[PDB]
Each structure stands twice: as structure tokens, then as C-alpha cells.
């Protein structure tokens, strides 16, 4: 066929019940993730092609960057709890990978302060039980799909995107192929 298991996607041997409809994992330490977000804009182009009523979820992961990696997963939980993802995503990516000005939990916090999140608001969220559970949701989702690499995208807890099995000489074409595969899997 055109879309084939093992080409544009793989199927989880052990499907995940109740998973988000479109789930992406990433790390702010992840060179391809930085590419996916700033250069390729994968999330935004997938969203443009998603059917009615399908929401996209994006979680941070721990296994890159050691102690800072965990701090970033907790900060991403803060970003989700406060709804400021679109204010911190770029400076976090650039702080970690471009300027290398993010070396501690304090430097992470600086990004939120510079983005206009109040210090007292940031700290109350950072320490909150709501954020501890949102950390746990991210960790659970990754564990459930036995995630060992990022970027990664999963559809309905059953299918995993296989970007390796797509074209990459044209960036634009890769992105639409990625987005179209998500739409196809979405309707499957």
C-alpha cells in the first residue's frame, strides 16, 4: 500500500489503553527536538491537519541531561499547569542548546521570569502537588510506551511515527509527510 506498518509508522506490540490521541515526547537537550520545534515546526503542522476534536499532548522526558533533564521535566510541568508553553519553549531550547545559558534550576526559572511569569507564581507551581502529578503523568506516559528515544510521536497509544521511513532531502516535504501520516493514523 501507500501507508505500511514498518514504513511511516510502527505498531506497539503492547497497546496503551487510555493514552492521549496525539502524544509527542521531547527533551530540551535533544538536537533533533530543537530541529523539530524551531526549524521543522512539526507540532504546528501536525495540528493544522488534525481532524475535529483531536487534541495534541506534548511531554518532556528525563533520560537526557541528567539532573538538569529532570529539572526540565518539572519546569515543563510548570509550563503546562500555568498554560505558558508557547512562551517558554523557544527560550528553553535556545538556553540549553544555542546560548548554553541554562545550567541550573535557577537559570530555568530565569526564563519563566523573563517571559513574565511572576516569581511567586512560578515557585508556588514548582513546589505544588499539582505539578508533582503532572511530572508523574509525563513519566507514566513515557514508561507505558517503553520510550528510549526522542523526538517521538504516538497515535492513540497504538502507533509510533517512524520518521526514518520518510524523505529528508526536502524539509518541507518531510514535514507534510509526517503530518499526513499522523492524520492517516488518526483516522485509522
Identify which of 59, 75, 62, 81 has the alpha carbon closest to the alpha carbon of residue 112: 75
66-82 and 105-114 helices, crossing angle to 10°: 30
Left (φ > 0), alpha (ψ -120 to 50) or beta: where does 65 sit?
left
Identify which of 154, 111, 120 has the alpha carbon closest to the alpha carbon of residue 19: 154
3-state secondary structure the chain: CCCCECCCEEECCCCCCCCCCEEEEECCCCHHHHHHHHHCCHHHHHHHHCCCCCCEEEEECCCCCHHHHHHHHHHHHHHHHHCCHHHHHHHHHHHHHCCCCCCCHHHHHHHHHHCCCCHHHHHHHHCCHHHHHHHHHHHHHHHHCCCCCCCEEEECCCEEECHHHCCCCCHHHHHHHHHHHHHHHHHC
With vertex at residue 76, the alpha carbon angle to CA 96 and CA 80, rounded to the nearest 5 degrees, is: 145
- Residue 77 grid cell: 510541568
Note whether 183 and 162 are within 8 A (CB).
no
Residues 6+ apart with CB under 8 A from 2: none
Phi, psi of 98, rounded to the nearest 5 degrees: -100, -60
As a whole number of angstroms, the distance between CA 68 and CA 102 comes to: 9
As a whole number of angstroms, the distance between CA 5 and CA 161 comes to: 10
Note whether 73 and 140 are within 8 A (CB).
no
- Residue 124 grid cell: 508556588
Beta-bridged to residue 60, according to DSSP, are 26
For 1-188, give the CATH class.
alpha beta
Identify which of 36, 23, 33 has the alpha carbon closest to the alpha carbon of residue 185: 23
State the structure-solving technique: X-ray
CA distances from 177 to 4, 6, 58, 127, 142 (A): 13, 15, 20, 41, 24
As a whole number of angstroms, the distance between CA 119 and CA 40 comes to: 32
Question: What is the stated resolution of the deposited model, in angstroms?
Answer: 2.0
**Residue spans per domain, the chain:** 1-188
Amino acid at each position: 500500500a501507500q501507508y505500511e506498518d514498518g514504513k511511516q509508522y510502527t505498531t506497539l506490540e503492547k497497546p496503551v489503553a487510555g493514552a492521549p490521541q496525539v502524544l509527542e515526547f521531547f527533551s530540551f537537550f535533544c538536537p533533533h527536538c530543537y530541529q523539530f520545534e524551531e526549524v521543522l515546526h512539526i507540532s504546528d503542522n501536525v495540528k493544522k491537519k488534525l481532524p475535529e476534536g483531536v487534541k495534541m499532548t506534548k511531554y518532556h522526558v528525563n533520560f537526557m541531561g541528567g539532573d538538569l533533564g529532570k529539572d526540565l521535566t518539572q519546569a515543563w510541568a510548570v509550563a503546562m499547569a500555568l498554560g505558558v508553553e508557547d512562551k517558554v519553549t523557544v527560550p528553553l531550547f535556545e538556553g540549553v542548546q544555542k546560548t548554553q545559558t541554562i545550567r541550573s534550576a535557577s537559570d530555568i526559572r530565569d526564563v519563566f521570569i523573563n517571559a513574565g511569569i511572576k516569581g511567586e507564581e512560578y515557585d508556588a507551581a514548582w513546589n505544588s502537588f499539582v505539578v508533582k502529578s503532572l511530572v508523574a503523568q509525563q513519566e507514566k506516559a513515557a514508561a507505558d510506551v517503553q520510550l528510549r528515544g526522542v523526538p517521538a510521536m504516538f497515535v492513540n497509544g497504538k502507533y509510533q511515527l517512524n520518521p526514518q521511513g520518510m524523505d529528508t532531502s526536502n524539509m518541507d516535504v518531510f514535514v507534510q509527510q509526517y503530518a499526513d501520516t499522523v492524520k492517516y493514523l488518526s483516522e485509522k
